[PDB]
Automatic annotation (TrEMBL):
<feature type="binding site">
    <location>
        <position position="15"/>
    </location>
    <ligand>
        <name>ATP</name>
    </ligand>
</feature>
<keyword id="KW-0418">Kinase</keyword>
<feature type="binding site">
    <location>
        <position position="16"/>
    </location>
    <ligand>
        <name>ATP</name>
    </ligand>
</feature>
<dbReference type="InterPro" id="IPR027417">
    <property type="entry name" value="P-loop_NTPase"/>
</dbReference>
<keyword id="KW-0808">Transferase</keyword>
<dbReference type="GO" id="GO:0015937">
    <property type="term" value="P:coenzyme A biosynthetic process"/>
</dbReference>
<dbReference type="GO" id="GO:0005524">
    <property type="term" value="F:ATP binding"/>
</dbReference>
<feature type="binding site">
    <location>
        <begin position="11"/>
        <end position="16"/>
    </location>
    <ligand>
        <name>ATP</name>
    </ligand>
</feature>
<comment type="similarity">
    <text>Belongs to the CoaE family.</text>
</comment>
<dbReference type="InterPro" id="IPR001977">
    <property type="entry name" value="Depp_CoAkinase"/>
</dbReference>
<feature type="binding site">
    <location>
        <position position="174"/>
    </location>
    <ligand>
        <name>ADP</name>
    </ligand>
</feature>
<feature type="binding site">
    <location>
        <position position="174"/>
    </location>
    <ligand>
        <name>ATP</name>
    </ligand>
</feature>
<feature type="binding site">
    <location>
        <position position="14"/>
    </location>
    <ligand>
        <name>ATP</name>
    </ligand>
</feature>
<feature type="binding site">
    <location>
        <position position="65"/>
    </location>
    <ligand>
        <name>CoA</name>
    </ligand>
</feature>
<feature type="binding site">
    <location>
        <position position="15"/>
    </location>
    <ligand>
        <name>ADP</name>
    </ligand>
</feature>
<comment type="function">
    <text>Catalyzes the phosphorylation of the 3'-hydroxyl group of dephosphocoenzyme A to form coenzyme A.</text>
</comment>
<comment type="pathway">
    <text>Cofactor biosynthesis; coenzyme A biosynthesis; CoA from (R)-pantothenate: step 5/5.</text>
</comment>
């Protein structure tokens, strides 16, 4: 199916742009959403994690205590392989299920932190969600609880803003009034619908 890659640095806010495409009926595939789904309350994988490592892995509301799991892996790198063997098949299965269940004219792929292959290996078009560097820093602090200096270190190690803008086919600035961002999404949606029709001919 016709696929648009949604990319953006940490602190771009790109998940809110993805949500706007979802509101227009577009299937959104996001590895971070899928990874959370496979360890949701009541899941066999969450049970296995808690039975191995302890009841602190489960919050009062039944969900995974993510910090407790990161602490376990930080103290015991030898458990990474077990956790991968548990979760990887589930993530792959759910990714493929979501792809096969899609009936929309095109798909939006939310590009993860790790970019080690050309985006065009999966995608027909690349949409970058751009914000000023100061905005990236502020949004990273507020979402991850890191210091400003830590945020700067994270950003310096990602692709630069100029590199991301140059690689894009389209750019959406995730700034200003939310209604204008949504109208910009709607315009890009129309472009992608037309490109999907052209590709299908
Ligand atoms: Cl194109």
């Amino acid at each position: 199916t016709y696929t648009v890659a949604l990319t953006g640095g940490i602190g771009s806010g790109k998940s809110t742009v993805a949500d706007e495409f979802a509101h227009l009926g577009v299937t959104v595939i996001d590895a971070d959403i899928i990874a959370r789904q496979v360890v949701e309350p009541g899941t066999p994988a969450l049970l296995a994690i808690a039975e191995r490592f302890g009841p602190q892995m489960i919050n009062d509301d039944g969900s995974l205590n993510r910090r407790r799991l990161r602490e376990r892996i930080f103290a015991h790198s030898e458990d990474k392989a077990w956790l991968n063997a548990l979760l990887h098949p589930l993530i792959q299965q759910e990714t493929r299920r979501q792809m096969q269940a899609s009936t929309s004219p095109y798909l939006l792929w939310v590009v993860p932190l790790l970019v080690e292959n050309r985006l065009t290996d999966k995608a027909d078009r690349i949409l970058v969600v751009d914000v000023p560097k100061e905005t990236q820093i502020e949004r990273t602090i507020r979402r991850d609880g890191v210091s400003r200096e830590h945020a700067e270190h994270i950003l310096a190690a990602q692709a630069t803003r100029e590199q991301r803008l140059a690689a894009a086919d389209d750019v959406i600035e995730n700034m200003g009034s939310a209604d204008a961002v949504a109208s910009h999404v709607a315009r890009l949606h129309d472009k992608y619908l037309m490109l999907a029709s052209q590709a299908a001919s």
